[PDB]
Design a protein around this ligand. Structure first.
Ligand code: HEM
Ligand SMILES: C[C@]12CC[C@H]3[C@@H](CCC4=CC(=O)CC[C@@]43C)[C@@H]1CC[C@@H]2O
Length: 377
């Protein structure tokens, strides 16, 4: 199924590690060392997108020196001491969410927990008032939505609805930013307005797209990370109990979950200058797809790479990327995923995988549905 691409990754890692897809004229790297270099060697592999212009005004499609300046300003709202300030608040949202599924022996992890949590957390951290939370969730859904099919009529119908959602969401953020200027709070928008690098501040044209990027890059990744982590835990007997009895292994397990079932399987780069990888030449301009999922299953990088080992420490996966584009939200994803698993391991003494349905999203590795038989404590 689409939830087991790993045999194919292993095949590619052994048969065509650096593969050229003649049809699309795009490269694909699967070896850990090759993927690591493609996503980190900024001098030879760029993030800028020449042609085919969902990421464009964000720092994801930027290179230095433009990227460096915005990255150093947005980093001030995600420091370790800021993460500790959010912890208690995220714990309350999590308990409220898990609490609603009390009184049932079967739950759907996605619809009842993993999908709504990240939206609820980012909404709360962005200072979205409770009266506008329902409308904010709709906008977010439209932002991370994909068309029914590749049929051009279906694609054009979707673009119109998604472009209006983006316009209304952007306008909503535009007004919130101005309102927060005269009444600053502890919300991320308030923090970004006050952030300054020698007097250099983000403008409204850079602030609004960054807010959209937080939803775009953190909603489904976190949702899938939680889903994939729970699936990996229940897949290996005794692990659920092991984590419940020794709760300080959870962060390590979260890192192993990112290595075992990375929610973002591949990252995209564009050749900046002529170079080579494992006897094969890549010409400047060609698109490269670095498969993080395959790199984290590489047998030459990890011992017993096909086994979920919650005791691996340090974990050198590159599931959050590597280099100047290292996921800005990793501290929040790590915090949010830990709390989610802590809540599950406290509210339930036993959980059993009933059925799963993979997320149909091509560029994503996660579950649409995760039916679980559960026993409350
Ligand atoms: C939940 C698990 C997540 C995973 C596995 C993940 C993965 C990644 C990866 C691999 C990149 C590198 C992109 C590149 O090199 O082109 C990235 C970038 C980024 N992520 Fe995440 N992400 C996650 C969650 C989040 C969250 C929760 C947020 C925000 C709250 C977030 C915000 C960002 C941003 C802003 C960037 C751009 C960094 C830059 O371009 O400098 N991500 N993410
Ligand atoms: C990794 C990522 C999800 C997948 C994105 C990636 C940007 C590049 C990209 C190009 C595509 O056209 C498909 C999605 C991908 C592969 C995103 C940047 C951060 C986000 O989490």
């Amino acid at each position: 199924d689409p939830y087991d691409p790993f045999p194919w990754y292993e095949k590619m890692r052994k048969e065509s590690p650096v593969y050229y897809d003649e049809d699309s004229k795009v490269w694909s790297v699967f070896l850990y060392d090759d993927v690591k270099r493609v996503i980190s060697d900024k001098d030879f592999f760029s993030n800028q997108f020449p042609q085919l212009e969902t990421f464009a005004k964000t720092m994801v499609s930027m290179d230095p020196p433009k990227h460096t300046r915005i990255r150093s300003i947005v980093s001030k709202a995600f420091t370790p001491r800021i993460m500790k300030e959010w912890e208690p608040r995220i714990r309350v949202l999590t308990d409220e969410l898990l609490g609603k599924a009390r009184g049932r022996d079967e739950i759907d992890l996605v619809q009842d927990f993993s999908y709504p949590l990240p939206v609820m957390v980012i909404s709360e951290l962005l200072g979205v008032p409770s009266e506008h939370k329902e409308k904010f969730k709709e906008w977010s859904d439209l932002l991370v939505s994909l068309p029914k099919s590749a049929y051009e009529e279906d694609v054009m119908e979707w673009r119109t609805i998604r472009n209006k959602g983006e316009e209304d969401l952007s306008a909503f953020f535009e007004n919130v930013i101005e309102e927060k200027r005269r009444n600053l709070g502890d919300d991320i928008i308030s923090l970004l307005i006050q952030a300054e690098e020698d007097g250099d501040r983000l403008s409204p044209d850079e602030l609004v797209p960054f807010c959209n990027l937080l939803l775009l890059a953190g909603n489904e990744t976190t949702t899938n990370l939680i889903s994939n982590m729970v699936y990996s835990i229940l897949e290996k007997p005794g692990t659920f109990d092991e984590l419940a009895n020794q709760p300080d292994l959870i962060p390590q397990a979260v890192e192993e979950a990112v290595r075992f079932r990375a929610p973002a399987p591949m990252i995209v780069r564009f050749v900046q200058q002529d170079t080579a990888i494992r006897g094969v030449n890549l010409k400047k301009g060609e698109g490269v797809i670095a498969f993080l999922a395959s790199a984290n299953r590489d047998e030459a990088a990890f011992e017993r790479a096909h086994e979920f080992d919650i005791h691996r420490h340090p974990n050198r996966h590159i599931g959050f990327g590597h280099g100047i584009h290292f996921c800005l939200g990793a501290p929040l994803a790590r915090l949010e995923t830990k709390i989610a698993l802590e809540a599950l391991l406290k509210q339930y003494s036993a959980m059993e995988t009933i059925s799963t349905e993979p997320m149909a999203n091509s560029s994503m590795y996660g579950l649409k549905h995760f039916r679980l038989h559960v026993k409350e404590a």
